[PDB]
């Protein structure tokens, strides 16, 4: 098991899903089509912002 | 593949694959029947000759 973490804007939360096309999903972080595992996302406005 | 996302494309393409695969199965299992109705005729002609 290896975990990957990063901070993204709320407008690209859905782009983490495999098969999504976009500026961030194609140029920053893309998941494989037969991706195994899953992600955890939340609005951490208190700390990051 | 060029119009739909890959997350459901495998599901989408599966029922297209089984459609052709099942159709080929129907043709071959009927072609064997027509062989039997010919294999019977071949033996009849062989006895006739």
Q: Is A10 helix (H, G, I), strand (E, B) or coil?
A: helix
CA distance B7 to chain A (A): 6
Solved by what technique? Answer: cryo-EM
B38's enclosing H/E stretch is helix B6-48
Which residues 6+ apart lie within 8 Å of A35 measured at CB?
Answer: A18
Interface of A with B in 2-41 (CB under 8 A): 17-20, 33
**Alpha-carbon gap, residue B2 to B21, rounded angstroms:** 22
- If you ran DSSP here, which 8-state letter would residue A24 be given? H
CB contact under 8 A, B6 and A18: yes
Say whether residue B7 is in contact with chain A using an 8 A CB cutoff.
Answer: yes
Find the Cα–Cα–Cα–Cα dihedral A15, A16, A20, A21, rounded to 10°: 60
């Amino acid at each position: 098991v290896y975990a990957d973490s990063f901070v993204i804007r709320g407008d690209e939360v859905r782009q983490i899903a495999p098969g999504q096309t976009g500026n961030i999903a194609d140029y920053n972080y893309k998941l494989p089509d037969d991706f195994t595992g899953c992600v955890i996302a939340w609005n951490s406005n208190k700390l990051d912002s | 593949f060029s119009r739909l996302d890959k997350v459901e494309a495998e599901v989408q393409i599966d029922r297209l694959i089984t459609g052709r695969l099942q159709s080929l199965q129907t043709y071959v299992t009927q072609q064997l029947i027509r062989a039997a109705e010919i294999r019977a005729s071949a033996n009849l002609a062989a006895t006739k000759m």
